[PDB]
Amino acid sequence: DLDEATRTVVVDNAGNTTVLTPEQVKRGKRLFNATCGACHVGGITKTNPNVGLDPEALSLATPRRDNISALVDYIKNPTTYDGLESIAEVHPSIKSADIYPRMRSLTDEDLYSIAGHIMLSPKIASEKWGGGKIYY
Amino acid sequence: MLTLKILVYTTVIFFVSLFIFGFLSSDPSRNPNRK
Amino acid sequence: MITLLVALLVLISLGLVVTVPVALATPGEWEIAKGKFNRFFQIWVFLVIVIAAADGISS
Amino acid sequence: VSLWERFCAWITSTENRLYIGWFGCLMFPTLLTATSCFIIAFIAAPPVDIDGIREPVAGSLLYGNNIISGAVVPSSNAIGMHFYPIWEAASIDEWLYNGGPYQLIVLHFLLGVSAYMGREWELSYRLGMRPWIFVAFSAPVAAASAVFLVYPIGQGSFSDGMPLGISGTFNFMLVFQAEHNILMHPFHMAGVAGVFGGSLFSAMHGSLVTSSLIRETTENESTNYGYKFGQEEETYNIVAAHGYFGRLIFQYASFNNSRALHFFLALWPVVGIWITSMGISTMAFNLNGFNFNQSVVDSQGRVINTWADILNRANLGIEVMHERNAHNFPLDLA
Amino acid sequence: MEALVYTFLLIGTLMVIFFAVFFRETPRIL
Amino acid sequence: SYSEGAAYGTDQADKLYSPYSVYSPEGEKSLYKPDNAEYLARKKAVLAETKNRLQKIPAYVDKKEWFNVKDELTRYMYETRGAVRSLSSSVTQKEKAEVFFRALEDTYGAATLKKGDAVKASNDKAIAALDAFTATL
Amino acid sequence: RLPEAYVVFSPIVDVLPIIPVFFLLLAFVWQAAIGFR
Amino acid sequence: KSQINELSYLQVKGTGLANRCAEVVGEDSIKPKPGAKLVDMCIEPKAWAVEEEVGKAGKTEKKFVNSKVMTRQTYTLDAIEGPITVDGGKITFNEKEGIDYAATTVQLPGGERVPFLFTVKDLVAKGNGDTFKPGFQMGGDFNTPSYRTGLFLDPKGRGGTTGYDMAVALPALQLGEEGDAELFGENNKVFDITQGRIEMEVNKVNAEDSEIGGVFVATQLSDTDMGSKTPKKVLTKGIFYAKVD
Amino acid sequence: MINWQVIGQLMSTAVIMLAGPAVIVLLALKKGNL
Amino acid sequence: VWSGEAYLSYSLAAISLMGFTAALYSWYNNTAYPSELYGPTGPEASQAQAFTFLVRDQRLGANVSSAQGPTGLGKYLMRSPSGEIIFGGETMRFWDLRAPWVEPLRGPNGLDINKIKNDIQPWQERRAAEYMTHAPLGSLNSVGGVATEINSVNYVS
Amino acid sequence: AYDFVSQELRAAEDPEFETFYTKNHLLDEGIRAWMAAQDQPHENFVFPEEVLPRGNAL
Amino acid sequence: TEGTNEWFGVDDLRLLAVLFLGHWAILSLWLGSYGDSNEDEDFFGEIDYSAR
Amino acid sequence: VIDYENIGYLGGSSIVDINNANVRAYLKMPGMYPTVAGKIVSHGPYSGVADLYKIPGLSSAEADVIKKYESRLTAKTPSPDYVIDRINNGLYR
Ligand code: CLA
Ligand code: CLA
Ligand code: CLA
Ligand code: CLA
Ligand code: CLA
Ligand code: CLA
Ligand SMILES: CC(C)=CCC/C(C)=C/CC/C(C)=C/CC/C(C)=C/CC/C(C)=C/CC/C(C)=C/CC/C(C)=C/CC/C(C)=C/CC/C(C)=C/CC1=CC(=O)C(C)=C(C)C1=O
Ligand SMILES: CC1=C(/C=C/C(C)=C/C=C/C(C)=C/C=C/C=C(C)/C=C/C=C(C)/C=C/C2=C(C)CCCC2(C)C)C(C)(C)CCC1
Ligand code: OEX
Ligand SMILES: [Fe+2]
């Protein structure tokens, strides 16, 4: 019941929508829990609960972050929420990936599926993603 | 408060020494089998 | 050659464990035949040194 | 002849009213101090800062309590795991404020119960008995040291220790449920089977003896007077109770051996409480029970609820409400 | 006034524990 | 298939590092390229500030503050050993670094024992040793 | 994982820590075959 | 001191030394610069007194009885910063940051426990002359915040900015036109700000080390639990210490 | 793509789990000192 | 008792002494068991949380020393019952936590407020955020977090 | 046996009096509010986020 | 001063004279019977029934 | 307080208070969290939106995002229990 209309996610800042092949949604979950899910489990952020992975919260960032192309942009260059300065030194990234050993082996399609998981999960679970413990 | 404290270490190592020198007092031989 | 000798090292330790406690729990099988078995210990120990040699050369 | 030999002869005499023994040299001074401080701290003791937030929790009878709500409050969160005797407190008023008598009672309790256990060994040695009643008493000693000693160690404070009371017990059990999920842990499961099984085989053995009693009385006097004390005749037909239970379930499930029967009554609870008390111990170090929350999903990926998800929402209610002022940060690490 | 009843029930319970241990009907053979 | 747990290699199309992993190896098509200059410039920048954090050492030993000298060489200088081991590429470059460490570990070993000259002596064995490191490579 | 000369035996090594449990069960199997005598 | 700075951390901990303010040595004068900023002002009180109705021979005038502190060693203020502005007639001080509150609880005769927030928040000191002298004496008002921030939950679960607002296990109280207005005071939680007056007195200065220190006396008002009771006047005395820079 | 790992693990347990009772079964046929 | 089984019950008493002690090394000690290898301790992950939100709200221009907590204590920095400047919360019980990423911020008195306002190094922020998310809180089916955490992570310390 | 009214009348008038017994009622408000939304789907409890009793910072 | 690393909690010098006179006051009682005995008399038992 | 007026201006009316709102309330305005919102919450009582330009340490870009939402920003009476928990009131998602 993973219909291709449900797997169809927004891909660029303009608003084009492409679909995710079924290996993208499967590797997208395994990589997200292994890499990102230590702090971003279920959409909330443990170390800074103001800045979540909500589709509301990704949209209100000063660069809009809802897109797949915008999320993989954030991974290679994480600015702040207002986007003025970089926090690559403290968030795990590709630019600052000498300190974080977890991101030394990631390809373009691997970040394409991790960002696919962050975008396709509010479409599956509407209120559980980043809703905190109220919506467990 | 350092007067009570003196009184406790008397009472502890009084009874602890009765325990320690109780089983050193040939305690396996105190059975109803023999002696 | 290391992958061939370790595979020969495992198959001997399969052959020993099936046969060596059978050779000991029998009332006479170890005394009647151990010079047969003592070769297989000396072959088995010799393989460990050959593999330890081939590992140090290859690294 | 010597003064010590005339003292060792008295202290190990079975001719005393209560056997004192060498463990009673540190059982009786410990448990009488745990007692005489408990009666005073339960009746007349001022309120105690337990959360370390200077909100003193009343626990004694003179400050408006009863048998149920009154309790000797555990020590402060400010102290935590530190040893806090009277002489390291600079006044008794500073001692009673910060949860003084919880450490004085508990530490003299666990020494006196571990000495009451060795005392059960000692008299079995001097009476000619086979020795192991004290191994059966290891099972509540394991459980007493689990909630008063081991759980404050792994959680790092005596404030998480069990309150010496009745309503304080259920504050302990519910907060332990939200933070550790004890009901899904298989060691609380193995001791619920220990005491449901224990109360089964108690009332199952006690009925089959009382069923098969031999006629020794009249219908006017009591049933119990057909046993004269110290008699050598067997007071019940054990073949009768074996043929009953041999037909009540089937033949091969019945112990004809009364020794192996009276051993299984000692095995089942005691093994069930050894295992349970090492459930609190392994959950003292935050190795919690099972967690099957969001385990059943459809092919779309939506979470299908189970009974564990309903059980989770009961745990989330206690977790967000226990120590409602003590927390400042999003995760109860303690 | 209310807690006076609770104390009397507790120490009154500890009395009958005292009498049951020391003034027990001592069982005798023959 | 979506909920297959022990699909070690039939699931994904790219070769993994091991069947017991999720990640792909350190081969091609990765986004982390360790030859990049900004990784070299990050490691070079901590070596420059390390000498600047190390010249403030005698100012606390001229004073009486031993708690400030025990942690000045761990507060900022924690990131040194990660860099100076990484910058050490050639042969004689590598055995130059343990001259710097053993001179640096005696500054901390003298600050805990509160020896004033043994800090000031071994501090000069450290500035001279990082001088040997930076000037070569 | 294991070194490259030893990546072949990665299934066999996964079984190996279980084998000490199999000695506990080997005692009871031996007591069954002896007839518990 | 600098003698305290000689020690390491493992030698201070568990000894009760970090609670105690330093002892300044000697007396001279020091002049506050134009950009002079006070650095390490610590305040520690050594005695406490609560104004009560005292039992004299025949009279009941209000006097201070002393009290024993029960929170253990958590009373000292520390790290209090602030610029020293130079008015023409009198040198002034206005504190800016630092740990400027230390909650504590003292016990009276009778068994009454009186908590109070001991604080120097928003302090405006004013003292005679310009330079710090052994005869110098400054003081001024400080604002005491409430002892509990408004999201504190009482045993029923009622706070000023959160919680319920009615007796939650007494559901028949809100019946009728009157409602529960008989117990209105225990439902409305009011954040309270009072005043306090501290009076410091420098008596020993180093100018070669630029650190001063002397005896103060502070009076303030205890807490009320957001209007639960009448607060009581609390006097305290002790010693302070400051680094004038 | 025929999942060589699981095929390797399930055979290698079944070799080892059958190499234990085969020590006893070969002794019961031999009537040795069990 | 000089017999065969008596020597066995002498060992079993002493091996249990070593059994508890190695089980208490692994919970508290971060020297023989480095937190870089075994993960953060029970006490260490309680302090890393309070340090992370200390860094978080210091960037919002908040004076963290004078930040009055909701109970009236320190929200971030308070004072231990021996007098030392510590972290506040339920983490006030673990005020003896001596760890290689917090000992750069110590003094004689404790956490030096001047060193918190000025010298926080980003490797300490990368360490306290790593030790918050990998706290030693688990389950038997090996899902991390609190007892009410959802099933996404796979970690027990 | 839900409440001791002498404990409840006192804790209402004195907002400082706390026992272990009144601590168990606040644990029961968490059970009565948090699970009852998913407990009884027939009754359709739609609670807002702002009525559910949370503690401080949990 | 609680968390000081002092032997047996002996803070003051006076507490030592309490410890030494506690172990020795019962030791001297114990030596009145089990002391001054033959330290060279053996047995091939598991348990000795020598004397009082 | 039982009956506190201006509950709406705190977080949810989409017209925020200045001297009583949490720093989470300025998260709904793109551009202000965390830098520009960090300065507003940190300093003392304001009497109007014109006092937002009196903040020590403002840029032209920091005044820019205030200029966008100056219709949505408004200032009310500072009730002193809300003014304390402006950085952190113990609310986490
Ligand atoms: C048959 C004998 C033998 C043995 C025992 C070894 C053993 C070893 N060789 Mg080696 N080698 C051999 C023959 C042997 N080799 C031959 C014939 C040659 C060709 C001439 C080489 C050439 C060679 C090279 C070129 C190299 C090695 C290396 C090594 C070491 C690998 C570990 C390592 O990296 O060092 C680090 C050390 C350790 C990891 C310590 C491992 C030992 C620990 C303490 C375990 C022992 C515990 C205990 C004994 C076990 C309990 C048993 C108890 C029940 C009795 C290892 C100790 C390497 C080496 O030494 O590099 C440093 C290496 O580069 N070998
Ligand atoms: C005799 C039984 C007994 C025992 C075991 C204890 C035990 C204790 N009491 Mg208690 N007490 C007792 C009787 C006892 N009490 C009585 C009768 C009273 C009434 C007066 C009190 C009144 C009392 C109060 C009022 C308080 C205590 C407290 C304490 C605790 C610490 C006291 C202390 O410093 O011990 C002193 C112990 C030692 C010096 C150690 C002795 C151990 C010896 C040395 C054996 C070790 C052998 C050695 C390792 C061999 C080494 C060999 C070498 C070669 C290596 C401790 C749990 C305090 C407490 O619990 O506060 C929380 C407290 O405040 N007690
Ligand atoms: C059907 C429901 C059910 C049942 C049967 C049980 C059964 C049990 N639970 Mg459990 N539990 C349940 C539901 C249930 N649970 C639920 C729903 C929760 C979540 C709220 C829990 C949470 C929970 C916790 C948190 C704990 C248990 C524990 C236990 C065990 C208690 C046994 C015990 O402590 O005795 C052992 C005996 C003692 C502790 C007493 C020692 C007394 C000493 C020896 C002497 C005292 C002498 C006394 C002072 C004076 C004597 C008299 C005098 C006059 C002489 C038992 C296996 C406990 C456990 O796991 O074991 C520790 C425990 O801590 N449960
Ligand atoms: C409707 C009746 C009923 C039944 C059948 C059970 C059955 C069970 N409960 Mg349960 N329970 C019940 C009512 C019931 N409960 C009630 C009313 C409550 C309170 C509200 C609880 C509270 C409760 C708790 C809190 C727990 C259980 C647990 C258990 C399990 C083990 C208990 C045990 O071994 O007891 C001791 C009794 C025996 C050992 C006698 C043997 C019992 C077995 C099941 C019968 C064997 C027959 C066999 C299956 C048939 C084959 C034999 C054939 C060849 C002849 C078991 C599944 C525990 C659990 O979760 O375990 C998984 C547990 O933690 N129950
Ligand atoms: C099939 C039966 C069997 C098995 C498997 C064992 C297994 C063991 N016994 Mg043993 N034992 C048995 C029957 C058995 N026993 C019988 C019937 C008796 C007569 C009552 C004993 C009496 C006995 C004694 C008296 C002791 C053991 C010990 C041990 C342990 C040695 C390893 C160890 O301690 O590592 C852990 C220690 C290390 C890794 C450090 C190295 C230290 C060395 C190996 C200690 C060696 C101690 C040595 C075995 C004891 C001397 C026995 C000798 C006089 C015969 C091991 C668990 C010893 C022990 O400590 O465990 C309880 C011990 O003290 N056993
Ligand atoms: C079910 C069985 C079981 C298993 C699998 C383990 C497993 C483990 N135990 Mg263990 N333990 C068990 C039962 C078990 N335990 C029991 C029943 C007890 C008694 C209660 C203990 C008591 C115990 C203690 C006391 C400790 C462990 C520890 C450990 C861990 C490390 C093993 C170790 O230290 O090797 C020990 C190996 C030896 C003693 C053999 C000798 C090793 C020599 C001395 C090493 C020399 C090294 C040298 C530097 C090499 C240089 C070579 C160079 C010169 C060439 C490991 C996880 C340790 C640990 O990490 O604690 C958390 C630990 O301290 N265990
Ligand atoms: C033809 C058509 C129409 C087609 C349809 C097919 C069809 C006919 C189907 C019907 C078949 C059908 C279902 C029938 C099967 C009947 C059946 C078994 C139904 C019951 C169902 C059921 C679930 C039963 C299982 C439950 C069961 C009874 C379990 C027994 C539990 C058990 C083994 C307990 C033993 C416990 C135990 C060891 C106790 C002893 C310990 C103890 C202290 C006892 C006390 C004691 C014991 C003594 O020993 C003596 C001496 C003395 C002194 C003494 O104190
Ligand atoms: C090291 C090694 C090796 C070897 C191995 C081995 C040889 C193992 C062994 C193992 C074993 C040694 C096994 C065992 C097994 C067993 C089993 C698995 C059994 C079980 C069974 C059961 C369990 C049953 C039982 C019973 C009976 C019989 C009767 C009574 C009852 C009962 C049920 C109990 C090899 C070569 C691979 C190579 C690599 C390395
Ligand atoms: O102290 Mn008693 O309860 Ca064990 O969790 Mn953390 O700490 Mn507190 O909170 Mn929850
Ligand atoms: Fe019986």
UniProtKB/TrEMBL annotation, chain A:
Residues holding heme b 1: H40, N48, H91
Domain Cytochrome c: start-end pairs: 23-122
GO cellular component, one term: photosystem II
Keyword Metal-binding: yes
Residues the record lists as binding heme b 2: H40, N48, H91
Residues given in the record as heme c binding sites: C36, C39, H40, H91
Annotated localization: Membrane; Plastid, Chloroplast thylakoid membrane
Assembly and oligomerization: PSII is composed of 1 copy each of membrane proteins PsbA, PsbB, PsbC, PsbD, PsbE, PsbF, PsbH, PsbI, PsbJ, PsbK, PsbL, PsbM, PsbT, PsbY, PsbZ, Psb30/Ycf12, at least 3 peripheral proteins of the oxygen-evolving complex and a large number of cofactors. It forms dimeric complexes.
Family of the protein in this entry: Belongs to the cytochrome c family. PsbV subfamily.
Function (record text): One of the extrinsic, lumenal subunits of photosystem II (PSII). PSII is a light-driven water plastoquinone oxidoreductase, using light energy to abstract electrons from H(2)O, generating a proton gradient subsequently used for ATP formation. The extrinsic proteins stabilize the structure of photosystem II oxygen-evolving complex (OEC), the ion environment of oxygen evolution and protect the OEC against heat-induced inactivation. Low-potential cytochrome c that plays a role in the OEC of PSII.
Name this protein carries in UniProt: Photosystem II extrinsic protein V
Native organism: Chaetoceros neogracilis
Encoding gene (name): psbV
Stretch of the intact protein here: 28 to 163 of 163
TrEMBL record, chain F:
Keywords for this protein: Signal, Thylakoid
Organism listed in the record: Chaetoceros neogracilis
Top-level lineage group: Eukaryota
Protein known as: Extrinsic protein in photosystem II
UniProtKB/TrEMBL annotation, chain H:
Keyword Signal annotated: yes
Main localisation: membrane
Annotated keywords: Membrane, Photosynthesis, Photosystem II, Signal, Thylakoid
The UniProt record lists the keyword Nucleotidyltransferase: no
Disulphide bond pairs: C21-C42
Domain of life: Eukaryota
Biological process, per Gene Ontology: photosystem II assembly; photosystem II stabilization
Listed GO CC annotations: photosystem II
Localization annotation: Membrane
Record family assignment: Belongs to the PsbO family.
Protein name: Extrinsic protein in photosystem II
Native source species: Chaetoceros neogracilis
Positions spanned in the full protein: 62 to 306 of 307
UniProtKB/TrEMBL annotation, chain M:
Subcellular location: Membrane
Membrane topology value: Peripheral membrane protein
Keyword Membrane: yes
GO cellular component: extrinsic component of membrane; photosystem II
Keyword annotations from UniProtKB, A to Z: Membrane, Signal, Thylakoid
Protein name: Photosystem II 12 kDa extrinsic protein
Keyword ATP-binding: no
Family statement: Belongs to the PsbU family.
BP-aspect Gene Ontology terms: photosynthesis; photosystem II stabilization
Gene behind this protein: psbU
Coiled-coil zones: none
Principal location: membrane
